[PDB]
Each structure stands twice: as C-alpha cells, then as structure tokens.
Write a protein that binds this ligand. Structure first.
Ligand code: NDP
Ligand code: 1QZ
Length: 186
C-alpha cells in the first residue's frame, strides 16, 4: 500500500459526531460523495478497503452494514473477532495495512480509505508516506461530542482544486459546505 486516504465531514467547531450519529441533519449529496469516493476502485476485480473504529461501525445503520461494494475492516483492541457483518478485524492501523498484503487480500484491494472516528484519523494522519485527506467543511457550528484533530500545515497542503472534487460552496437543506482536499507526500 503506497497511499492512504482519509475522508471526514466536520463542523466549524471541529465536530464530527454527537450521540453516536452525525451532529447535523442528513445531507444526501454529501453522503453520495462519501459513497463515491470510498467505493470507486480504479481496478476492475478489486474493491477499496474501508477502515473504521468500533463506534463508527455501530453508528452505521445495521441494514447498511457492511458498506456495500467495499471491504469493511474494524479496528478494536478489545474485540477478539470482527463484529457481525464486518469482513476483518485488526488491533491497529499497522496491522490492518499488513493484512492487505497477506494471501486472503493480496490482489483484492485497490485504495484504502480511513472513515473515522477521531483516534483512527489521528493515527492515519501521522502514518508515513503519501496521504490525502478529503475534508468536508460544514460551515456552521453544531453541538458535538466527537471531534476532528486539527490539520498540521507543516505536513499537509490544502490543494486549491482537485480533479473529481467540486470547488464551489455547496448547499443542502440550508447548510453550506465545501469539499477540501489536503495532501502530504512523506
Ligand atoms: N462526520 C464524520 O465524517 C464521521 C463521524 N463519525 C461519528 O463519530 C462518532 C464515532 O467516532 P468515535 O467516537 O471517535 O469512535 P471510533 O469509531 O473511533 O471508535 C472508537 C473505538 O474504536 C477502536 N479504535 C479507535 N481507534 C483505534 C486505533 N487507532 N487503533 C485500534 N483501535 C482503535 C477502539 O475500540 P476498543 O475499545 O474496542 O479497543 C475505540 O474504543 C459517531 O458519532 C459517528 O457518527 C464517525 C466517522 C466519521
Ligand atoms: C457524514 C457522512 C460522511 N461524510 C464524509 N465526508 N466522510 C465521512 N466519513 C462520513 C461518514 C461517515 C460515517 C460515520 C457514516 C455514517 C453513517 O450514518 C448513517 C452512514 C455511513 C454510510 C456509508 C456508506 C454507505 C452507507 C449506506 N447506508 C447507511 C450508511 C452508510 C457512514
């Protein structure tokens, strides 16, 4: 694996979660963007891998688990096997990435997407090598109990535009947001 991707939507006050769900009402096109980015493989015959923490797994409505069209991996130190419906379980991000190279997954994974929550993002963003962060900036404060770590501009550059990502401010249900892409190479 030569590259990792993180994807997150975050409020102006750095919130990503409230009470096991999103802090804001459902935004259909923002969800479709999440679906498109995490699902689209560039290699016919391979699927992308999604890596998430345990609470994020359980925040997905049961009827939609595992996330369709993607290999679902859950991180937990306490669990001894994957939650029902999840494809894989690892004790750390490092263990998850090594798994991609073992025989079960060897030629099955295209891109790797980190989909939260807070501690998974923190570790991934510090992982060596090339990383892209797809950050949706929800331009309103929302009451939250789970937060996104601040992006270190010593490491990450905000890319001005990016192929495949809309640049203009979006609006759904009266909530303005914008898609950002950050990158580090090392
Ligand atoms: N706005 C957004 O883009 C997103 C929002 N969310 C929201 O965030 C909240 C859930 O996220 P959060 O509360 O941060 O919890 P997590 O999804 O990160 O789950 C936490 C648990 O995951 C395991 N875990 C987390 N990080 C690691 C790690 N780096 N290595 C090994 N195991 C790890 C641990 O499990 P154990 O205790 O078993 O060891 C930990 O207790 C929900 O409200 C959800 O709706 C989540 C993702 C995205
Ligand atoms: C806020 C949605 C979102 N946006 C971005 N840009 N990045 C993200 N990581 C997320 C997210 C998220 C997680 C927590 C999440 C929550 C959630 O609550 C309902 C649903 C999904 C999800 C992801 C993919 C397909 C799904 C199909 N059905 C239900 C849920 C699906 C995924």
């Amino acid at each position: 694996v030569g590259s990792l991707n993180c994807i997150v939507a975050v409020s102006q006050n750095m919130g990503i979660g409230k009470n096991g769900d999103l802090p804001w009402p459902p935004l259909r096109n923002e969800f479709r963007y999440f679906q498109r980015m995490t699902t689209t493989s560039s290699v016919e015959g391979k699927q992308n891998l999604v890596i998430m923490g345990k609470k994020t797994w359980f925040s997905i409505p049961e009827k939609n688990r595992p996330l369709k069209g993607r290999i679902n991996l859950v991180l937990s130190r306490e669990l001894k096997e994957p939650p029902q419906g999840a494809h894989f379980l690892s004790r750390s991000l490092d263990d998850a990435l090594k798994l991609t190279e073992q025989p079960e997954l060897a030629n099955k994974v295209d891109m790797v997407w980190i989909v939260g929550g807070s501690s998974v993002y923190k570790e991934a963003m510090n992982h060596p090598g090339h990383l892209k962060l797809f950050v949706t900036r929800i331009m309103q404060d929302f009451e939250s109990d789970t937060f996104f770590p601040e992006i270190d501009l010593e490491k990450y550059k905000l890319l001005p535009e990016y192929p495949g990502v809309l640049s203009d401010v979006q609006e759904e249900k009266g909530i303005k947001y914008k898609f950002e892409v950050y990158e580090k190479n090392d």
